[PDB]
């Protein structure tokens, strides 16, 4: 669906520009910058969690949602992905959701941003 004007991920408020920047960073697989280590990766939708995706069928991918993005990291120059993520449709780039590890059932769990 359309990227929302704002999202609140456990107290970190991100704009539509932040979200678009994350998706475009995820999709930037052309040679120069390098793609980040470990991202984007497949998003695994957990049946016991309550995440609502607004993009229809998978496959889905997940990329870190950070300020002044896009996220980058490597083992040599590491930056935490932090708790916040954008989920997008791997093949179309369509926005699906923003989710966060903040306030989740466990360290690896997700809850939906608002
Ligand atoms: K690139």
From Swiss-Prot:
InterPro entries: N1-like, Ribonuclease/ribotoxin, Ribonuclease_N1/T1
S-S pairs: 1-54, 9-113, 55-96
Catalysed reaction, written as an equation: [RNA] containing adenosine + H2O = an [RNA fragment]-3'-adenosine-3'-phosphate + a 5'-hydroxy-ribonucleotide-3'-[RNA fragment]; [RNA] containing guanosine + H2O = an [RNA fragment]-3'-guanosine-3'-phosphate + a 5'-hydroxy-ribonucleotide-3'-[RNA fragment]
Enzyme class: lyase
A molecular function GO annotation: metal ion binding
Binding site for Ca(2+) 2: 29, 31-32, 39
Catalytic site: 41, 62, 101
Site (Methylation inactivates enzyme): 62
Binding site for substrate: 39-49, 85, 108-110
Keywords: Calcium, Disulfide bond, Endonuclease, Hydrolase, Lyase, Metal-binding, Nuclease
Ligand binding (Ca(2+) 1): 29-30, 32, 37
EC number: 4.6.1.20
Family: Belongs to the ribonuclease U2 family.
Protein name from the UniProt record: Ribonuclease U2
Organism: Ustilago sphaerogena (Smut fungus)
Gene assigned in the entry: RNU2
